[PDB]
Amino acid sequence: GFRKMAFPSGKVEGCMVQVTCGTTTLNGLWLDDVVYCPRHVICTSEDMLNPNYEDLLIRKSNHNFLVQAGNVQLRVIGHSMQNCVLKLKVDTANPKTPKYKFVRIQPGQTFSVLACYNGSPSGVYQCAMRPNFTIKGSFLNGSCGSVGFNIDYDCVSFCYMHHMELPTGVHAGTDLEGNFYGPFVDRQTAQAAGTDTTITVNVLAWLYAAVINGDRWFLNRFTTTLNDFNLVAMKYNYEPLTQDHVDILGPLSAQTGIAVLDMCASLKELLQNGMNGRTILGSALLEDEFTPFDVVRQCSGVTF
Amino acid sequence: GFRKMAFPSGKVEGCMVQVTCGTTTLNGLWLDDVVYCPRHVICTSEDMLNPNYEDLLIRKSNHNFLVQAGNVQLRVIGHSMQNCVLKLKVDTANPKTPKYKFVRIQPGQTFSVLACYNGSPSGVYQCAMRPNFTIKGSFLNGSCGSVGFNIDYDCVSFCYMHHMELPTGVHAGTDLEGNFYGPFVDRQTAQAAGTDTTITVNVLAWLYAAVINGDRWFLNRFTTTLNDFNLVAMKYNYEPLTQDHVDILGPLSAQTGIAVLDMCASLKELLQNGMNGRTILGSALLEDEFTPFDVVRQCSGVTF
């Protein structure tokens, strides 16, 4: 048994608040005495085409921001802009503030999203940062300000805040310092995401997962080289594999007794021949949103 | 965008504790001054083949149970057996006790699992109760006592506690009153799960989800009857559909303008013709672990 598993959400749930500016409601992240939220909260429908955020923020007073933490109305005592985030200084430190860090993740890494509406948690699920710096999330109107995170030991590492849906129906957002992942801007304009690619190291991790769960039909007696594998990779829009990827997969290799370059030969055959109506871990497609760390945690039982 | 989404786990996280009896550690659920856990915690390796739980529990003293809530060691002041659960009366009420209910769910319904090791949360994911009263979870050694739950409004409804893995690699467990779901016993013996079937109403809900997410290739101009659909259903090991199922799907029907019996004709074609290498919501197989309620929550944005 092997599932898409999210981190436990409790420590983030106690940080989620509602932020209203005019008729626009979305979510904020209440850490210590600062609420972080998307700066587009200050936009009117009209402003959203080509907003001058500097001029719009000058228009705003602390009293134009209605922040609720469940029942409590939090008084905003200061407002400032960092990149695409608004920091709303509030009169109360969050007593539910967990230990935390702000981190900028790499493309191919995974995180949990706590999807929120009206400052209330709705649900938690795992996402990857796509190589083209989009995410394939589940987000309705008013989900903006929902965050992505990892937990290490007892520390929440915030890596994502939700801002927008692209034409293609994928999602874009920032780190908690307000810098977009990828080329996107917080403007209601047609914006191209790059060509996306499949995260090869993650497909290999998931093939290792399949083998640990005794699902090993796709194994073949052959090996390959990074060099020769990367030829097929480029043909099927897979990211090239590096020795770093090979080193990262060592625990699953050593755990299974299958060399990385042997697994890579099995992947080559799957891309060329397809799956002949066979499934791997109850899927009819190659899965690329589990990192090697994700597989090790689910197949070794790491807790927080 | 449409994901397997778990409920937020915070309110359950504060209830999870470690329960050790000899060399056996698993998890317990600390509500008020009672810790609930699988009664097989009291078994030795040997006892597990054919345990006489009444005689084994008589052997045990409060002092044979080591219960930790994070740092705190909880003193057990009473022990009793209800069906397949142990209730360990402790000297401290859990100050983190949420509002809660114990519910016995129906086959075909979904719940969130907080997978735990050593009384520490590892992760949260959605499960269905299979028609054969098993669950396809992700659980390692020491995951016993992990619980499944739903949240309504502000109330946690506990419906599952994990006890065992079946030969097939699926999972079995009890309600929080200690009654197994299905024919299973807490004995380390070969036990047959029934033939499993596909949860038809859930596959229809997910086809509705696909249509809401504008993924509608599989729609055809035809209708059918419960009567005639149920002929194909029985042929492909799908549960029969009732008017109750039709009524349950009304919100998604009314939401989409597609009649239930029209969706049922599309499902008939998919079962007979397969998917021709096309995907629905980024899946190459028919998904049956989303209930109509699950689809409505993800596609209407219900919070807690």
Curated annotation (Swiss-Prot), chains A, B:
> Cytoplasmic side of the membrane: what ranges?
1-304
Q: What outcome is documented for mutating K89R in this protein?
A: In strain: Beta/B.1.351
User: Which locations, inside or outside the cell, does it occupy?
Assistant: Host cytoplasm; Host Golgi apparatus; Host nucleus
Explain what the record says happens when changing L204V.
In strain: Zeta/P.2
* Glycyl lysine isopeptide (Lys-Gly) (interchain with G-Cter in ubiquitin), cross-linked positions: K4, K89
Means of activity regulation: Inhibited by pyridone-containing alpha-ketoamides compounds 13a and 13b. In turn, alpha-ketoamide 13b (tert-butyl (1-((S)-1-(((S)-4-(benzylamino)-3,4-dioxo-1-((S)-2-oxopyrrolidin-3-yl)butan-2-yl)amino)-3-cyclopropyl-1-oxopropan-2-yl)-2-oxo-1,2-dihydropyridin-3-yl)carbamate) inhibits SARS-CoV-2 replication in human lung cells. Inhibited ex vivo by michael acceptor inhibitor N3. Inhibited ex vivo by compound 11a and 11b.
Catalytic residues as annotated in Swiss-Prot or TrEMBL:
H40, C144
Q: Which residues form the Peptidase C30 domain?
A: 1-304
Describe the reaction catalysed, as an equation.
TSAVLQ-|-SGFRK-NH2 and SGVTFQ-|-GKFKK the two peptides corresponding to the two self-cleavage sites of the SARS 3C-like proteinase are the two most reactive peptide substrates. The enzyme exhibits a strong preference for substrates containing Gln at P1 position and Leu at P2 position
Q: Report the protein's function.
A: Cleaves the C-terminus of replicase polyprotein at 11 sites. Recognizes substrates containing the core sequence [ILMVF]-Q-|-[SGACN]. Cleaves and inactivates human TRMT1, preventing tRNA guanine(26)-dimethylation of tRNAs. May cleave human NLRP1 in lung epithelial cells, thereby activating the NLRP1 inflammasome pathway. May cleave human GSDMD, triggering alternative GSDME-mediated epithelial cell death upon activation of the NLRP1 inflammasome, which may enhance the release interleukins 1B, 6, 16 and 18. Also able to bind an ADP-ribose-1''-phosphate (ADRP).
Give the multimer and partner information.
Answer: 3CL-PRO exists as monomer and homodimer. Only the homodimer shows catalytic activity. Interacts with host FBXO22; this interaction promotes the proteasomal degradation of nsp5.
Name of the protein described by the UniProt record: 3C-like proteinase nsp5
Origin species, per record, is: Severe acute respiratory syndrome coronavirus 2 (2019-nCoV)
Relative to the complete UniProt sequence, the shown stretch is 3265 to 3568 of 7096
